[PDB]
């Protein structure tokens, strides 16, 4: 194929999120995952799953895998959107076309991840974050694949799909020009936890210097600290439905600002067309901001799918940095 470059194809989910596939056990056993750079653990719904959410999912059968390596360590995987239960197990994970004995979680209780889990098409979540972000300290997949001379560089890359325009790819091992436009620009991680970097946040006249910015493929929206969100919805003609993170605006609202993130290396912007979600069925020419107030311990912005949809992103483990370039409209 492409020398040392994998390429797990991505497919959009409801035009907001995206999924990719991978397998466990020496007998393949395919699973649709959410490729989450926002987490560092790999879990899959087990045949031992007894919760309703699993009814619709592809399940993992260890007894059918010559590679299965038991463990049984009870484990709870916690996310911002939910919680998933099960236990540790090790088997042959296959991403793209590379396999490797990998440790993961067999989930048997998905009640804490509802209604999200039953309303989605994915089976499990495959973390792509850092070792310190995981549970049961598991070295990342791309790291191991590198530490096992299976790939050239300890880094993966994302080119999110566009529903009826083009699919996408999760390239592992190396960077490919077919995916981007203009020059790449690297920003150093301020910590080896989430793929978190430091940038100045500037929307209208609101500005947050040295804000923590998490590049997260596992987040469907653009997260913004509460205070910032409130000041941001000021002289705008947006409608917040009381007690709902539902902000309605006229898609053509000429007051809608453009997010501006900057460092001494570059300037990344996100215009309304990138963070607006069409809501035509609710009302004609109507849109919702797909932005949300979320306060972390330290002022943080989660650059979710909206950002990554406009910006081709490189996640370098070896250089501990994030590459950012404009994505090609088409392939």
């Amino acid at each position: 194929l492409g020398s040392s470059n994998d390429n797990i194809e991505l497919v959009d989910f409801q035009n907001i999120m995206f999924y990719g596939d991978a397998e466990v056990g020496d007998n393949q056993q395919p699973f649709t995952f959410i490729l989450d750079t926002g987490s560092a653990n790999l879990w899959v719904p087990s045949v031992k799953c007894t919760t309703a959410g699993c009814l619709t999912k592809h399940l993992y059968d260890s007894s059918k895998s010559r590679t299965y390596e038991k463990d049984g360590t009870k484990v709870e995987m916690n996310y911002v959107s939910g919680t998933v239960s099960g236990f540790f197990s090790k088997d042959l994970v296959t991403v793209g076309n590379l396999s490797l004995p990998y440790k993961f979680i067999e989930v048997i209780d998905t009640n804490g991840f509802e209604p999200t889990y039953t309303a989605s098409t994915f089976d499990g979540i495959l973390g792509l974050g850092w070792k310190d972000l995981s549970i049961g300290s598991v070295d990342p997949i791309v790291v191991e694949l590198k530490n096992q001379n299976k790939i050239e560089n300890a880094l993966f890359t994302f080119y999110l799909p566009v529903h009826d325009k083009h699919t996408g790819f999760l390239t592992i091992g190396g960077i490919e020009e077919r995916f981007y436009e203009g020059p790449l620009t690297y920003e150093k991680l301020n910590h080896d936890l989430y793929w978190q970097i430091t940038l100045d946040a500037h929307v209208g006249n609101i500005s947050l210097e040295k804000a923590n910015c998490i590049v997260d493929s596992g987040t469907s929206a653009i997260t913004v600290p509460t205070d910032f969100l409130n000041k941001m919805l000021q002289n705008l003609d947006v409608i917040k439905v009381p007690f709902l993170p539902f902000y309605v605006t006229l898609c053509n609202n000429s007051k809608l600002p453009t997010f501006e993130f900057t460092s001494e290396n570059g300037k990344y912007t996100l215009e309304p067309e990138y963070y607006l979600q069409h809501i035509e069925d609710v009302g004609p020419g109507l849109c919702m901001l797909n932005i949300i107030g979320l306060d972390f311990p330290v002022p943080t912005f989660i650059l979710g799918d909206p950002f990554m949809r406009k910006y081709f992103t490189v996640f370098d483990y070896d250089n501990h940095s994030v590459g950012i370039a404009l994505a090609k409209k088409n392939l």
């Binding site: 996310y79 911002v80 959107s81 997260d216």
Partner: peptide, 6 residues
Amino acid sequence: XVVXAX
């Protein structure tokens, strides 16, 4: 929405 780890 969906916000992926604690």
